[PDB]
């Protein structure tokens, strides 16, 4: 049992009032250049925000002018430190052995929707990175392709529906061809 | 604004009053790692899979909660008890896998543009109310510091079943009905 560490929120000196703390680690290229950002919010106004690239706490609206000075004194140590002790340690010890190591296998299926329309229905994947083409007889069809946005079902999956507008002659070879990278080999589905 | 491969929202307290409402949740690229339930004082992992390997000590949601109360204290005065402006949630209903008779699926109700973090999200089957096999998320942050929230329905498609997703939220005059049919 390796422990997950929280970023610390720092204290102070029929109508509803609302306060948010958003601590946020920005990774790029491994842990090669981490960026720490803490923001403090009244209702929706962001009033005071530490950001590692600036390196101190700053006000963001007039409502945080007094807040700035105080935090810079009582935290700021420990807050510069957080990047190196729970932006990093979080990533290099709990993200590596979990999220950065989820693959979830996709899930391709075709069907006639209503000259009709064919719906390639690519479900259940993770990561979000995915490619989905329409081959009617061996070559790729550009026109009559209308995809959705990349739905996010928020259980750590995805889905996307690619749509081909067509008209069935004879019996023809239709192909939803699908590249993820939980797939070493491209799923390719056949239709009538 | 703001280039990166991965985003860890680690520590995300939210407190709103009156009524004492709080919510401590971590995220990774947009999906709920876990929330701390505040009565019982226990981490609650989104996919219990994540519960076997790593632990989060829950008292640390409590700490971030405590300071988040305090600064509400201070700020609410400071702003001249400017109170928050009630937003209209939007709903879209969709299904996880394509729809096929007799095979079980999941109905999804996703609500975005929530503010405040109080909403009511419920399910209708031919307009009689449903609770069994419902799961609902945490509040999930956005950019403009709203929230979005989704609830899930266990069904088994059929005919003619008619499915409504219903939203109650103070920003709405009258409950919104989200209507869906296979």
């Amino acid at each position, epitope marked *: 049992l390796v422990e997950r560490l*929280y970023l610390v929120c720092g204290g102070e000196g029929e109508r509803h009032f609302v306060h948010q703390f958003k601590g946020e680690c920005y990774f790029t290229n491994g842990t090669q250049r981490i960026r720490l950002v803490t923001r403090y919010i009244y209702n929706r106004e962001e009033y005071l925000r530490f950001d590692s690239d600036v390196g101190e706490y700053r006000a963001v609206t007039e409502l945080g002018r007094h807040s700035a000075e105080y935090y810079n004194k009582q935290y700021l140590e420990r807050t510069r430190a957080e990047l190196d002790t729970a932006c990093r340690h979080n990533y290099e010890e709990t993200e590596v052995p979990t999220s950065l190591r989820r693959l979830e296998q996709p899930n391709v299926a075709i069907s006639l929707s209503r000259h009709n329309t064919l719906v390639c229905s690519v479900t259940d994947f993770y990561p979000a990175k995915i490619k989905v083409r329409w081959f009617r007889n061996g070559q790729e069809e550009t026109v009559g392709v209308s995809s959705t946005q990349l739905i996010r079902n928020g259980d750590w999956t995805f889905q996307v529906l690619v749509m081909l507008e067509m008209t069935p002659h004879q019996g023809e070879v239709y192909t939803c061809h699908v590249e993820h990278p939980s797939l070493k080999s491209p799923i390719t589905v056949e239709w009538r | 604004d703001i280039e990166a491969d991965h985003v860890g929202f680690y520590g995300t307290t939210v407190y709103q009053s009156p009524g004492d409402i709080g919510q401590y949740t971590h995220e990774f690229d947009g999906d709920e790692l876990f929330y701390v339930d505040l009565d019982k004082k226990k981490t609650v992992w989104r996919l219990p899979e994540f519960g076997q390997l790593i632990l989060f000590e829950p008292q640390g949601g409590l700490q971030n909660i405590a300071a988040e109360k305090h600064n509400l204290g201070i700020l609410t005065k400071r702003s001249n008890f400017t109170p928050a402006t009630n937003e209209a949630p939007q709903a879209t209903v969709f299904p996880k896998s394509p729809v096929l008779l007799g095979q079980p699926n999941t109905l999804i109700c996703f609500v975005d543009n929530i503010f405040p973090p109080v909403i009511n999200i419920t399910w209708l089957r031919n307009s009689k109310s449903v609770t069994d096999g419902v799961y609902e998320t945490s509040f999930l942050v956005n950019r403009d510091h709203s929230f979005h929230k989704l609830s899930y329905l266990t069904f088994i498609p059929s005919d003619d079943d008619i499915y409504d997703c219903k939203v109650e939220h103070w920003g709405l005059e009258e409950p919104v009905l989200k209507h869906w049919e296979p």
Partner: T-cell receptor
Amino acid sequence: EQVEQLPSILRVQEGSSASINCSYEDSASNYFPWYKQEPGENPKLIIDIRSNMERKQTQGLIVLLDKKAKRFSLHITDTQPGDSAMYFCAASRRGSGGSNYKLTFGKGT
Amino acid sequence: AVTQSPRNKVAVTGGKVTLSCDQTNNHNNMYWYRQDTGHGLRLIHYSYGAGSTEKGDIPDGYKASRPSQKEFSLILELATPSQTSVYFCASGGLGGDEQYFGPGTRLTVLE
């Protein structure tokens, strides 16, 4: 198991340097600081360090950490009687936490 | 700041003792330490909030209570000569780091 202080009792000539060792479990801990209980008084904080670095030196006060050794320690220059206090060594999982949330405190000097 | 009444009590074996604290820092977590020469700075009980009280290092004969943010009270149900020591209070929180200790409390039991 947790933290051992040392030295237990210590003398020093008025004008010499003075040093307190420490070690931990704990495992890595990210908060290790110091406390000066004045004769017949409360403990008040003097200096701290996290695993972020290994050397802090602040207004006549010298603190060192070796993380991998599970080892840190405290030094002063050109002493007086004014720095004759019961000094207190503690260490803790910076936060989050926890069981080993905060402090601890070794036996004392 | 912190304070604490009593600042010195003298007790009677088989009595009830109560030492209050009352921090005013709006702080989250409070702790009762006992400082005895030889044995250091030992932790009796503590808390993370108004309501709950957790066992510390040396909670034998020490039943501890905390009714609110401000107040944290150490209770010695039944006195004995060995309960005799100094006693300290300290608060910290929202959100640290730095334990703020109380002025002190010198107790004495007798047979």
